[PDB]
Amino acid sequence: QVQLVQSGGQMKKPGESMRISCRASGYEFIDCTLNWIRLAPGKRPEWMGWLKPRGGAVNYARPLQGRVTMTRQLSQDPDDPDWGTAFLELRSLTVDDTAVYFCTRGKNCDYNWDFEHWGRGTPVIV
Amino acid sequence: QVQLQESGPGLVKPSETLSLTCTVSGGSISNYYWSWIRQSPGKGLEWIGYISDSESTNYNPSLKSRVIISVDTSKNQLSLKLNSVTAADSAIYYCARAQQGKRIYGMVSFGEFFYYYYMDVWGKGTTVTVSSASTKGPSVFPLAPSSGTAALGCLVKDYFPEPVTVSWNSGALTSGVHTFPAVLQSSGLYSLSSVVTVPSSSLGTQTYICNVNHKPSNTKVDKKVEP
Amino acid sequence: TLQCTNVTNARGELKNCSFNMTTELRDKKQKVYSLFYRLDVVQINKEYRLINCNTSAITQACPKVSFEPIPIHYCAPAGFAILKCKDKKFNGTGPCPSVSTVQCTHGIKPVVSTQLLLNGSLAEEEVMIRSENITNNAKNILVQFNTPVQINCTRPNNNTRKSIRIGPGQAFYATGDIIGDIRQAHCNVSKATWNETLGKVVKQLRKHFGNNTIIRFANSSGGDLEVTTHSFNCGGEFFYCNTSGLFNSTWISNDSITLPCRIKQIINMWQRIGQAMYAPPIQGVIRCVSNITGLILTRDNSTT
Amino acid sequence: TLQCTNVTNARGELKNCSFNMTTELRDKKQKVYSLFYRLDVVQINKEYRLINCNTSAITQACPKVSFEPIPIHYCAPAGF
Amino acid sequence: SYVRPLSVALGETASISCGRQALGSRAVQWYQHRPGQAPILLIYNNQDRPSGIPERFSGTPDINFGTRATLTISGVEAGDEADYYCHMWDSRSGFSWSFGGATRLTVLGQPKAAPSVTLFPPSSEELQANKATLVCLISDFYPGAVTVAWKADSSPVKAGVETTTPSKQSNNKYAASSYLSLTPMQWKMHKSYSCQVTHEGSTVEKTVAPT
Ligand SMILES: *[C@@H]1O[C@H](CO)[C@@H](O[C@@H]2O[C@H](CO)[C@@H](O[C@@H]3O[C@H](CO[C@H]4O[C@H](CO[C@H]5O[C@H](CO)[C@@H](O)[C@H](O)[C@@H]5O[C@H]5O[C@H](CO)[C@@H](O)[C@H](O)[C@@H]5O)[C@@H](O)[C@H](O[C@H]5O[C@H](CO)[C@@H](O)[C@H](O)[C@@H]5O)[C@@H]4O)[C@@H](O)[C@H](O[C@H]4O[C@H](CO)[C@@H](O)[C@H](O)[C@@H]4O[C@H]4O[C@H](CO)[C@@H](O)[C@H](O)[C@@H]4O[C@H]4O[C@H](CO)[C@@H](O)[C@H](O)[C@@H]4O)[C@@H]3O)[C@H](O)[C@H]2NC(C)=O)[C@H](O)[C@H]1NC(C)=O
Ligand SMILES: *[C@@H]1O[C@H](CO)[C@@H](O[C@@H]2O[C@H](CO)[C@@H](O[C@@H]3O[C@H](CO[C@H]4O[C@H](CO)[C@@H](O)[C@H](O)[C@@H]4O)[C@@H](O)[C@H](O[C@H]4O[C@H](CO)[C@@H](O)[C@H](O)[C@@H]4O)[C@@H]3O)[C@H](O)[C@H]2NC(C)=O)[C@H](O)[C@H]1NC(C)=O
Ligand SMILES: *[C@@H]1O[C@H](CO)[C@@H](O[C@@H]2O[C@H](CO)[C@@H](O[C@@H]3O[C@H](CO[C@H]4O[C@H](CO)[C@@H](O)[C@H](O)[C@@H]4O)[C@@H](O)[C@H](O[C@H]4O[C@H](CO)[C@@H](O)[C@H](O)[C@@H]4O)[C@@H]3O)[C@H](O)[C@H]2NC(C)=O)[C@H](O)[C@H]1NC(C)=O
Ligand SMILES: *[C@@H]1O[C@H](CO)[C@@H](O[C@@H]2O[C@H](CO)[C@@H](O[C@@H]3O[C@H](CO[C@H]4O[C@H](CO)[C@@H](O)[C@H](O)[C@@H]4O)[C@@H](O)[C@H](O)[C@@H]3O)[C@H](O)[C@H]2NC(C)=O)[C@H](O)[C@H]1NC(C)=O
Ligand SMILES: *[C@@H]1O[C@H](CO)[C@@H](O[C@@H]2O[C@H](CO)[C@@H](O)[C@H](O)[C@H]2NC(C)=O)[C@H](O)[C@H]1NC(C)=O
Ligand SMILES: *[C@@H]1O[C@H](CO)[C@@H](O[C@@H]2O[C@H](CO)[C@@H](O)[C@H](O)[C@H]2NC(C)=O)[C@H](O)[C@H]1NC(C)=O
Ligand SMILES: *[C@@H]1O[C@H](CO)[C@@H](O[C@@H]2O[C@H](CO)[C@@H](O)[C@H](O)[C@H]2NC(C)=O)[C@H](O)[C@H]1NC(C)=O
Ligand SMILES: *[C@@H]1O[C@H](CO)[C@@H](O[C@@H]2O[C@H](CO)[C@@H](O)[C@H](O)[C@H]2NC(C)=O)[C@H](O)[C@H]1NC(C)=O
Ligand SMILES: *[C@@H]1O[C@H](CO)[C@@H](O[C@@H]2O[C@H](CO)[C@@H](O)[C@H](O)[C@H]2NC(C)=O)[C@H](O)[C@H]1NC(C)=O
Ligand SMILES: *[C@@H]1O[C@H](CO)[C@@H](O[C@@H]2O[C@H](CO)[C@@H](O)[C@H](O)[C@H]2NC(C)=O)[C@H](O)[C@H]1NC(C)=O
Ligand SMILES: *[C@@H]1O[C@H](CO)[C@@H](O[C@@H]2O[C@H](CO)[C@@H](O)[C@H](O)[C@H]2NC(C)=O)[C@H](O)[C@H]1NC(C)=O
Ligand SMILES: *[C@@H]1O[C@H](CO)[C@@H](O)[C@H](O)[C@H]1NC(C)=O
Ligand SMILES: *[C@@H]1O[C@H](CO)[C@@H](O)[C@H](O)[C@H]1NC(C)=O
Ligand SMILES: *[C@@H]1O[C@H](CO)[C@@H](O)[C@H](O)[C@H]1NC(C)=O
Ligand SMILES: *[C@@H]1O[C@H](CO)[C@@H](O)[C@H](O)[C@H]1NC(C)=O
């Protein structure tokens, strides 16, 4: 029962920044890698970067380096200990950043690029 | 169906028994719940108490130390006696029939229900004012027109307390009538001014007489209106 | 020392207790509150305290372990063997005529129950009763149904679980408040299915006591709470169901029977004197569906 | 609750914290102090506290065990 | 009890939310109470209405716990201006003795109506009774807020005038009296008396002379 829950949509202006979440549940958070994909109309789906909750190791895409930042915040309470919150921050926004931002996960934690699970989407309008 | 009508002194002195009664119409008294409600100016509705079809007592604890709601089934009449009244007890008293509803949310055997009460039919209301000042009758002074369409009425000067009822030709003339809200003068007496719009053809001559009634004074005066 | 009140209603069962509790810092206190069923608290002289304090320590159950009975298979080591018994009218003792061997037993579900055996294995053909010596009244008689009587149980209250940090990593899970209605936990059985099943049990009971004697059913005669009531687990909380409505029939020759159940969080289980367990409250509405397949009776000087 | 200051210098890294600590007798306290690198403490609102307190318990390493990597040899059992 | 304001437009929809939300299963009553008048039972059981209430008055039932009790008035009229009460009965709270708070629905955008001033001279019986009284009757104006000014010949009076607070009529308009008590000699020693009623935008004058 893998389920990814994101935050609500935001309307931003050029120069500001954004912060969106992605609470996962139903699987070991630190074992599977998470991604961030933006989808703009009339463009290719752009991969922003992946983040491994094991230590927070992250890898940003080149067209976004310096403007993108991905963190995590896994709960430290062993009763519901199977959930983390991947945060995405994009600074110095432009009108080209207007799209719907998703967080994805592979079908299994061995191969990351078979995005079987997707979030409902976080639309952003700059 | 069922309709009600209250009737009270209209004026009770401070620290005294506020007697009252209410006669229902077209219905039996011993098979419905009955609720008393008072509504003061500036304050919201206040639930006095209620009596059952088994004649059971249950008053608002905000007033229970003074209320006693009785009932006599020989007629369709049930009473209400608040005592030790103060200035805050001035309100319109409505006579409404409560009906019992049983809201079940769980098991009826475990007692998982609660009883709610709703009033469906209401009375017209009886104004009760408390003041050490005695009663006072009015004094009607006619208002004549001065010539298509014209207007005439009756000036009901200094009286106390509220209210008064105005009829025209004992009840025949009822179109175009416009009884106005009274005015509490600084002397402590209300002044009401009735007026009726009338075609200029009937000015000479269709007899017009205003009927003025003020119950707290046992008065029933009339007067003509003519140029 | 607990400062408890009644939870607002009108019977005042589950309480609303507050207490000065430790924090993550050894020099800071906190005034937190929680709900406790009255079966878990006792007064001093209003002031209360947990029931187990003057008896034993208490360990809160880990809310990540499962209270669910899993089919467990018992196997004999190499060089040994397990002997089955495929006799479909085999009472407990004696020589089983049809015997087979197995490396492992079947899926044993370790369902902790009382009075009424739950989720057990049915019997083929007819319902047999056991007991080692049926004429010895001090021997628990084990009756094993052949058809399953459906029993439904529920705790209708919508509960909440509040995590209370009481130290470095010590998080006690309390009952926050009750969302929505406050009702009564209970169980249901089909009176028709229970009437015919109580008929099936009184059938085989005549083969040991006589074809003319009267057979009477009554509730428990006393003892602890764990024995006088149907005690078990439903969604993760321990009921204690008054079975007086199930055992009330004297036999000679749409429906729904509802049992009033209580709930406890401070239990010792088994019957050991030394340690009690706090079961953290189950969030949401509780309801479980089980079959009662057995029964543990106890007879009481002539021919009745 | 830790009462910390900077260790006298001029960057203020490692702190100088004092606290009411328990003793050998359960009814006596003591006002002892210690140095803690800032990576081990966080403020409240100066007052501090150990970083792990709102997360987990903490066990002090035995100062008689060795942190030194020793050549470990992995061997397969007989038949492997 | 204090009053909660509300402002909806004519012909739109209203959402009178209850001020005392329920704790368990609820049985809410809704009452339409015009000031100084008999209240009207709109909804007695959470969703049920009596005989004689339009469909445009709907109450929210509690099928799943969480949905708060609200009163929905679709297609509001000018006559829907009154007070609304939420009589909240639930399983957790005890006996609902008091009614709700007070939601005074005020409908905006009603037709603007000009007043109708009618000034009467003193009566001959009261002039014979050694007293005078001018009665400046105002009615059929909207919005109900008027300013009354009395002039003796041409000078303001101010002394001895009582004025009605603009009460509401049956046709959803407003009316108010205006009394000026004069001495029988002061009424005869002057040439004319006027009643300036300045409603909303501009004023309307009615004059009366002792002839
Ligand atoms: C284990 O065993 C247990 C023991 O057996 C067993 O316990 C049972 O639990 C369930 C739930 O857990 C209980 O079910 C509840 O039952 C309540 C009572 O329902 C009965 O009564 C009502 C009202 O009866 C009056 O009105 C009808 C007409 O409407 C008349 O015909 C009656 O004669 C009666 O009028 C007289 O009596 C009044 C006294 O109450 C007097 O005041 C009055 O003046 C008159 O003299 C009936 O409507 C019910 O009939 C329904 O069932 C029959 C079968 O007999 C069917 O034909 C048909 O389906 C009928 O609908 C029944 O007789 C219910 O109130 C309750 O449901 C409400 O409450 C819950 C929670 O509060 C709500 O979530 C739910 O939505 C319901 O709310 C509706 O109703 C309320 C009140 O009316 C409204 O305020 C609310 O807005 C909402 O209205 C909406 O729905 C209506 C339809 O439901 C609709 O009309 C509206 O327009 C609106 O859309 C709930 O169902 C059950 O009682 C327990 N058993 C016992 C014996 O107590 C348990 O289930 C077992 N299993 C387990 C544990 O797993
Ligand atoms: C078990 O027992 C505990 C008590 O130990 C209960 O917990 C308390 O529950 C009550 C309600 O029953 C809570 O009281 C409510 O607090 C709200 C919070 O507002 C506070 O903070 C603001 C600042 O933002 C202050 O201005 C305000 O005065 C409060 O101090 C209030 O908003 C609530 O007000 C309500 O009541 C008033 C008076 O009737 C109304 O006028 C208001 O409109 C409003 O309806 C109310 O006062 C209290 O805070 C709870 N305490 C704690 C520690 O949580 C549990 O509920 C109880 N559980 C069960 C199951 O019984
Ligand atoms: C972390 O923070 C702690 C504080 O919590 C520091 O510990 C304190 O350090 C100060 C020095 O910085 C100590 O103060 C010194 O105490 C000496 C002991 O004498 C005391 O006892 C005699 C009785 O025999 C009294 O007469 C005397 O008044 C003292 O009460 C003093 O001798 C020192 O005096 C010096 O200063 C004065 C005034 O400037 C000079 O005139 C003197 O000549 C002399 O040079 C001084 O007062 C204090 O005692 C320490 N406290 C504790 C509890 O140990 C840590 O040093 C700090 N650590 C770091 C790394 O920053
Ligand atoms: C006797 O045996 C019964 C069945 O073998 C036991 O009933 C089981 O009870 C447990 C806990 O009381 C239930 O577990 C719950 O699961 C639900 C979610 O399940 C629903 O969703 C899944 C999809 O993942 C679906 O496959 C299911 O069919 C359900 O639709 C949650 O509320 C909780 O997580 C809870 O753990 C079992 O589901 C339930 N099984 C059945 C078949 O009903 C009963 O408890 C046993 N009695 C005793 C005394 O042990
Ligand atoms: C919760 O409610 C019960 C039931 O009303 C209370 O029980 C009463 O306890 C007092 C003790 O002071 C007795 O004198 C009464 O006879 C009891 N009543 C009944 C019906 O048994 C109980 O005290 C309440 N608890 C709290 C904390 O308020
Ligand atoms: C409770 O009722 C019956 C007991 O016989 C079980 O349901 C049947 O189980 C058998 C064996 O798996 C199946 O062959 C039948 O098809 C089942 N019947 C139905 C209608 O599904 C049920 O599993 C029992 N539950 C327990 C023991 O937990
Ligand atoms: C029991 O109560 C919980 C909350 O106390 C309810 O959970 C809510 O469920 C709805 C879905 O219908 C969500 O939108 C809310 O966010 C949930 N609330 C919380 C606090 O998580 C639950 O629905 C209730 N269930 C029953 C049967 O009453
Ligand atoms: C116990 O609960 C189960 C499940 O709610 C009940 O089985 C349902 O019975 C009704 C009535 O025959 C059927 O319409 C449903 O389809 C059944 N549910 C399922 C999942 O099959 C059962 O009747 C209840 N028994 C008792 C004694 O309460
Ligand atoms: C279990 O339920 C039975 C009834 O179903 C309860 O019997 C009551 O017993 C007391 C004396 O102990 C009598 O005064 C009552 O009249 C009985 N009630 C009925 C309805 O007969 C029994 O008390 C319940 N068990 C417990 C532990 O409360
Ligand atoms: C230790 O030294 C650092 C560096 O001077 C202090 O950091 C200052 O903290 C205050 C907070 O009150 C800020 O307003 C300043 O801007 C900080 N300065 C710098 C350069 O960052 C720190 O407060 C000192 N700690 C103690 C306990 O004295
Ligand atoms: C324990 O407290 C620490 C305080 O530092 C929390 O960590 C910070 O949390 C805030 C917001 O919660 C973040 O903005 C910081 O980035 C966090 N800092 C670090 C170093 O993690 C921590 O989340 C708390 N833990 C729990 C379980 O509540
Ligand atoms: C907590 O301790 C204080 C000490 O003054 C006391 O007054 C208070 O009653 C205690 N709280 C409880 C719930 O007993
Ligand atoms: C079981 O059967 C044997 C013989 O069939 C019999 O001797 C024994 O008494 C029976 N068990 C009981 C408990 O009656
Ligand atoms: C057993 O039934 C009797 C008679 O109804 C009752 O007095 C007693 O309290 C019951 N005991 C239990 C444990 O249910
Ligand atoms: C130790 O406790 C006392 C209690 O009076 C307090 O004044 C002092 O500040 C505490 N010490 C520290 C280091 O906080």
Author numbering:
A (entry chain U): 1 to 52, 52A, 53 to 76, 76A, 76B, 76C, 76D, 76E, ...
B (entry chain H): 1 to 82, 82A, 82B, 82C, 83 to 100, 100A, 100B, 100C, ...
C (entry chain G): 128 to 137, 151 to 185, 189 to 309, 312 to 321, 321A, 322 to 397, 411 to 457, 462 to 465
D (entry chain G): 128 to 137, 151 to 185, 189 to 223
E (entry chain L): 6 to 67, 67A, 67B, 67C, 68 to 95, 95A, 95B, 95C, ...
From the reporting publication:
The native HIV-1 envelope (Env) spike is a heavily glycosylated trimer of gp120–gp41 heterodimers, which mediates viral attachment and entry. As the main antigenic structure presented on the virion surface, Env is the sole target of HIV-1 neutralizing antibodies. Among the gp120 supersites, the CD4-BS is the most conserved and less protected by the glycan shield, making it a primary antigenic target for vaccine development. By docking and mutagenesis studies, we previously demonstrated that certain antibodies to the CD4 supersite, such as VRC03 and VRC06, establish functionally relevant quaternary interaction with two neighboring gp120 protomers in the HIV-1 Env trimer, while others appear to make contact with a single gp120 protomer.
Having demonstrated that contact with an adjacent gp120 protomer bolsters the trimer interaction of both CD4 and selected anti-CD4-BS antibodies, we hypothesized that conferring quaternary-contact capability might further enhance the function of already potent bNAbs that interact with a single gp120 protomer such as VRC01. While the binding footprints of both chimeric antibodies on the first gp120 protomer are nearly identical to those of the original antibodies, the FR3 loop-contact surface is mainly located on the neighboring protomer, indicating that the elongated FR3 loop establishes quaternary contacts without affecting the “classic” interaction. Besides contacting CD4-BS2, mostly through residue K207, the FR3 loop seems to bind residues with long side chains at the base of the V3 loop: the aromatic Y318 and the positively charged R304 and R308. Interestingly, we found that the FR3 loop-contacting region comprises not only part of CD4-BS2, but also elements at the base of the V3 loop, which form a contiguous surface distal to CD4-BS2 in the neighboring protomer. Both structural analysis and mutagenesis studies suggest that binding of the FR3 loop is mainly mediated by long-range electrostatic interactions between negatively charged aspartate residues in the FR3 loop and positively charged residues in gp120. From the crystal structure, Y318 seems to establish the main direct contact with the tip of the FR3 loop, but neighboring basic residues in V3, such as R304 and R308, are also favorably positioned and point toward the incoming FR3 loop.
